[PDB]
Write an enzyme that holds these catalytic residues in place. Structure first.
Site, short mmCIF file in Angstrom:
data_model
loop_
_atom_site.label_atom_id
_atom_site.label_comp_id
_atom_site.label_asym_id
_atom_site.label_seq_id
_atom_site.Cartn_x
_atom_site.Cartn_y
_atom_site.Cartn_z
N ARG B 45 45.55 45.75 47.16
CA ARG B 45 45.86 44.72 48.17
C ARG B 45 44.83 43.57 48.39
O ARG B 45 45.59 42.50 48.72
CB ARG B 45 45.49 45.50 49.56
N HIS B 49 46.28 39.91 48.96
CA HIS B 49 45.81 39.22 50.04
C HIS B 49 45.12 37.81 49.53
O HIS B 49 45.49 36.73 50.03
CB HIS B 49 44.52 39.99 50.70
N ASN B 77 43.30 45.15 60.53
CA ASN B 77 44.49 44.86 59.73
C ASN B 77 44.26 43.57 58.86
O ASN B 77 44.92 43.21 58.12
CB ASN B 77 45.88 44.45 60.45
N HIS B 179 53.22 49.20 48.54
CA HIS B 179 52.89 50.25 49.83
C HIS B 179 53.29 51.68 49.47
O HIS B 179 53.29 52.57 50.13
CB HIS B 179 53.70 49.74 50.99
C1 HEM Z 1 54.62 40.61 51.95
C2 HEM Z 1 54.47 41.56 52.63
C3 HEM Z 1 53.33 42.44 52.93
C4 HEM Z 1 52.71 42.47 54.27
C5 HEM Z 1 53.39 42.08 55.52
C6 HEM Z 1 51.56 43.40 54.12
C7 HEM Z 1 50.91 43.73 55.01
C8 HEM Z 1 49.81 44.79 55.05
C9 HEM Z 1 49.07 45.38 56.19
C10 HEM Z 1 48.96 44.82 57.42
C11 HEM Z 1 48.35 46.27 55.44
C12 HEM Z 1 47.49 47.35 56.55
C13 HEM Z 1 45.95 46.88 56.76
C14 HEM Z 1 45.52 48.10 57.77
O1 HEM Z 1 45.97 48.04 58.92
O2 HEM Z 1 44.65 48.51 57.26
C15 HEM Z 1 48.48 46.50 54.22
C16 HEM Z 1 47.98 47.26 53.25
C17 HEM Z 1 48.35 47.47 51.98
N1 HEM Z 1 49.17 46.49 51.35
FE1 HEM Z 1 50.51 45.16 52.01
N2 HEM Z 1 51.45 43.78 52.84
C18 HEM Z 1 52.53 43.13 52.00
C19 HEM Z 1 52.53 42.92 50.64
C20 HEM Z 1 51.78 43.59 49.83
C21 HEM Z 1 51.85 43.26 48.43
C22 HEM Z 1 52.51 42.31 47.55
C23 HEM Z 1 50.76 44.26 47.59
C24 HEM Z 1 50.28 44.54 46.47
C25 HEM Z 1 51.41 45.19 45.63
C26 HEM Z 1 50.34 45.15 49.04
C27 HEM Z 1 49.47 46.10 48.66
C28 HEM Z 1 49.11 46.90 49.96
C29 HEM Z 1 48.18 48.04 49.69
C30 HEM Z 1 47.89 48.89 48.56
C31 HEM Z 1 47.64 48.40 50.95
C32 HEM Z 1 46.73 49.46 51.39
C33 HEM Z 1 45.40 48.88 51.25
C34 HEM Z 1 44.25 49.86 51.60
O3 HEM Z 1 44.53 51.20 51.61
O4 HEM Z 1 43.31 49.71 51.58
N3 HEM Z 1 51.03 44.62 50.31
N4 HEM Z 1 49.49 45.62 53.70
#
Ligand code: HEM
Ligand code: HEM
Ligand SMILES: [Ca+2]
Ligand SMILES: [Ca+2]
Ligand code: NA
Ligand code: NA
Lengths: 309, 309
Positions: B45, B49, B77, B179
């Site tokens: 992430r 980010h 978030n 995700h």
């Molecule tokens: C473009 C649309 C995307 C949106 C709107 C988005 C949004 C988010 C949000 C809001 C969270 C949750 C944060 C929380 O509440 O703790 C999250 C977590 C995460 N996202 Fe996305 N995401 C997107 C794309 C990506 C991409 C491209 C990747 C990488 C391949 C990614 C990897 C992750 C991972 C692994 C988590 C979990 C992080 C953790 O457990 O610490 N996301 N994302």
């Protein structure tokens, strides 16, 4: 004399937690300044600079702050010595080792290092109140512009600013004595040379300054105290009496009726200056400090302690 | 397949300077993730980010940047894993030791660590273009607000944003596969529950979500992929098909006619997903990168290299 202590601070604040803290800082400064005499001026100015920008809270040590360690866009007169930032970090590291933990704040280190820089340069050994906490707030250019006094400012403007911050005319004349050591870039005083020379500059001094800065935009530095560039003493006041102060903020101290008597007093007695210095610099070093819950003790002076809380 | 390489970047960029760079990063990640499985999601992430905020230039790693390591004011978030920031710094240190100097940029470390996190989680091993330089520009809240996609955004909004940044519908559906691992705080999807439930959420899933987040403002987290929380696979797409996507940005991928076919394709073949992932994540990882003269190689990822130049 001893400076008045602000609520929350105290001398020997680390007496129980880390008694040898002050000795470690001095020993480091003595050796560091021996290798680089200019470091003393750098550290002394760093403490002053930080104190005026938001308060003596080590905010300018942060990379995220304007005029901080990573600043490369600011003009010469707003860029601090890289070695000064480095020295503080090194001291912080040595202290963590000595105290067996991050006990001493970077804010206190600034206060101590400044005192030691003065002492090492032949100045008075004064007591420093301790217990300041490090800020988690970055300094913005706005903060710098509103609270940091500029070299083109006259005594009237300076008294107003310092008055708001809790310092009086005596404090102003006294802390300005910091210019008894150190350097200044042409940019900080070129406006007193071009287009037309400042009439307060003595004819002889003017010739000298015009040699150093032949035209506006000259990239060169000169000493703040023409008499004893690297010795902490009252020669700075003697410079003023002889119309040889570098900045408007320097010379106007002798010009202004309110500050003139104090300048003349210090010019006549170094002891009078030294005794008052510990008090006034003590007051400056306690401006808008963070106490106990108001800040933190950085594990690295350049950054805020990472983590959600 | 292999992702298209942007001008200035190249595979094996460190072949001559530090050939074992990639091995060192992988070995570190393997061990680190073994001790903390969630670190994989954190690193993955973090790369995403950072890439969206100004570009894949390690700007968010800086303490001076919004959502950076010292951020404590941002909502759940918008707060990245503290362990993720730490891991990157540790990797950077290990690399300086291995390469006998600060050769590898923090930006590249982010790209490599993300790839390794995917691999360690059971995902595809894809090639990563290298040569990115670290930015000396801090990210402001404004930067985050304008370029970082939010979980409440629908496919129409996301396609517009990604379109401006050089990514198409396939890339969107593909990178969203990230995700398939990780966690999300109630705050990121509570708006799909209160005041009235999102009709796209399957009845069964809704009951489950209401249990996790009983009311708006619940401080609790849940998994992004209900089927295989910690395994990198195509189960995320199967979740979508079953109306069990957590965010609007997740579920709308199946709802939207443009993205639906791709979701169904990946749900049916993990191989199709894995092969496309290396390409799409490769494209994402090269958004607005700094090359050669455009940045620097940080000696510490949290701060810009100190000095006047
Ligand atoms: C473009 C649309 C995307 C949106 C709107 C988005 C949004 C988010 C949000 C809001 C969270 C949750 C944060 C929380 O509440 O703790 C999250 C977590 C995460 N996202 Fe996305 N995401 C997107 C794309 C990506 C991409 C491209 C990747 C990488 C391949 C990614 C990897 C992750 C991972 C692994 C988590 C979990 C992080 C953790 O457990 O610490 N996301 N994302
Ligand atoms: C309140 C009035 C003050 C003003 C307007 C002022 C202004 C400045 C400026 C513009 C410079 C020169 C920067 C350059 O061109 O490189 C400077 C240097 C210096 N100031 Fe002041 N200053 C003031 C007070 C202080 C105080 C309170 C101290 C501390 C006791 C101090 C210590 C120094 C030192 C030692 C230097 C030399 C720094 C070096 O060589 O690196 N100043 N000051
Ligand atoms: Ca002197
Ligand atoms: Ca999964
Ligand atoms: Na400050
Ligand atoms: Na970035």
């Amino acid at each position: 004399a001893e400076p008045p202590v602000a609520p929350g601070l105290s001398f020997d604040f680390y007496w129980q937690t880390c008694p040898r803290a002050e000795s470690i800082v001095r020993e480091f400064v003595q050796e560091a300044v021996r290798k680089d005499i200019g470091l003393a001026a750098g550290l002394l100015r760093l403490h002053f600079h930080d104190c005026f920008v938001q308060g003596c809270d080590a905010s300018v040590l942060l990379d995220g702050s304007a005029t901080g360690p990573g600043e490369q866009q600011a003009p010469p007169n707003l860029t601090l010595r890289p070695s000064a930032f480095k020295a503080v970090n090194d001291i912080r590291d040595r202290l963590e080792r000595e105290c067996r933990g991050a006990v001493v704040s970077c804010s206190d280190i600034l206060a101590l290092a400044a005192r030691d820089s003065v002492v090492v340069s032949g100045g008075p050994d004064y007591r420093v109140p301790l217990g300041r906490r490090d800020s988690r707030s970055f300094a913005s250019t706005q903060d710098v512009l509103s609270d940091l006094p500029g070299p083109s400012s006259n005594v009237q403007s300076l008294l107003a600013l310092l008055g708001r911050l809790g310092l009086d005319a005596t404090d102003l004349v006294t802390i300005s004595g910091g210019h008894t050591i150190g350097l200044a870039h042409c940019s900080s005083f070129e406006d007193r040379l071009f287009p037309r020379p400042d009439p307060t500059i003595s004819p002889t001094f003017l010739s000298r300054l015009k040699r150093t800065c032949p035209a506006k935009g000259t990239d060169r530095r000169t000493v703040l105290d023409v008499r004893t560039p690297n010795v902490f003493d009252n020669k700075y006041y003697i410079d003023l009496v002889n119309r040889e102060g570098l900045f408007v903020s320097d010379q106007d101290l002798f010009t202004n009726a309110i500050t003139r008597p104090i300048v003349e007093r210090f010019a006549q007695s170094q002891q009078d200056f030294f005794e008052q210095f510990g008090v006034s610099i003590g007051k400056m070093g306690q401006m808008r400090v963070r106490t106990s819950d108001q800040g933190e003790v950085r594990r690295n002076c350049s950054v805020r302690n990472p983590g959600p809380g």
